[PDB]
Design a protein around this motif. Structure first.
Motif, mmCIF file in Angstrom:
data_model
loop_
_atom_site.group_PDB
_atom_site.id
_atom_site.type_symbol
_atom_site.label_atom_id
_atom_site.label_comp_id
_atom_site.label_asym_id
_atom_site.label_seq_id
_atom_site.Cartn_x
_atom_site.Cartn_y
_atom_site.Cartn_z
ATOM 1 N N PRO A 90 0.813 -1.197 0.000
ATOM 2 C CA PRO A 90 0.000 0.000 0.000
ATOM 3 C C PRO A 90 0.836 1.231 0.000
ATOM 4 C CG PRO A 90 0.103 -0.850 2.239
ATOM 5 C CD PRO A 90 0.920 -1.789 1.346
ATOM 6 N N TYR A 145 -7.199 7.999 4.203
ATOM 7 C CA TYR A 145 -7.540 7.631 2.853
ATOM 8 C C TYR A 145 -6.883 6.320 2.562
ATOM 9 C CZ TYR A 145 -9.056 12.413 2.205
ATOM 10 O OH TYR A 145 -9.705 13.659 2.346
ATOM 11 N N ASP A 146 -5.951 6.316 1.582
ATOM 12 C CA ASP A 146 -5.404 5.078 1.087
ATOM 13 C C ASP A 146 -3.976 4.994 1.520
ATOM 14 O OD1 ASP A 146 -4.284 7.064 -0.535
ATOM 15 O OD2 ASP A 146 -4.298 5.810 -2.369
#
Length: 175
Positions: A90, A145-146
């Motif tokens: 990620p 968020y991400d």
């Protein structure tokens, strides 16, 4: 899990095995993985590292062995280069947190994430959590968020039923 579950790995050295965090071609784990019990009494980590080689480190991600091709020490965390990039890395950044900020710790038992729990640092920069018992190398993070912002790596459980750990720069929180 923060989707960090795919990044959860195990790093074993000698007879000591602890959890590690596998991001990109980099695997981070507590430096004490190089320590033996006797060494732990009064370790010279530099001395330990210099007598150790790539082959001394066995890094396992599931049933896949990650060949360690390089190792270097940064403070109290050990930085290992592995021969393959985690395909599900990620977006992440390393941040240093303060007490009072809540964050999530992906507690792992025997390398297996077994639940996501919220932990928060006390002013004395410890965390409490029996779920963290028998876990080490577990990481803490926050999700924005991400982007996974890592804030914690478990380094040791204290006998007082609190746990001590570092940032991902291997710098201890607290004394």
């Amino acid at each position: 899990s923060g989707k960090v579950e795919g990044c959860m790995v195990q790093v074993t050295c000698g007879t000591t095995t602890l959890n590690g965090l596998w991001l990109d071609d980099v695997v981070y784990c507590p430096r004490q993985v190089i320590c033996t019990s006797e060494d732990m009494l009064n370790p010279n980590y530099e001395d330990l590292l210099i007598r150790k080689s790539n082959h001394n480190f066995l890094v396992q991600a599931g049933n896949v062995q990650l060949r360690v091709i390089g190792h270097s020490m940064q403070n109290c965390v050990l930085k290992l280069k592995v021969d393959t990039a985690n395909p599900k890395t990620p977006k992440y950044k390393f941040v240093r947190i303060q007490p009072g900020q809540t964050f999530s710790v992906l507690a792992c038992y025997n390398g297996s994430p077994s639940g996501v729990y919220q932990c928060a640092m006390r002013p004395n920069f410890t965390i409490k959590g029996s779920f963290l018992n028998g876990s080490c190398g577990s990481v803490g993070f926050n999700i924005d968020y991400d982007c996974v912002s890592f804030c914690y790596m478990h380094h040791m459980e204290l006998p007082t039923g609190v746990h001590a750990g570092t940032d991902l720069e291997g710098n201890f929180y607290g004394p």
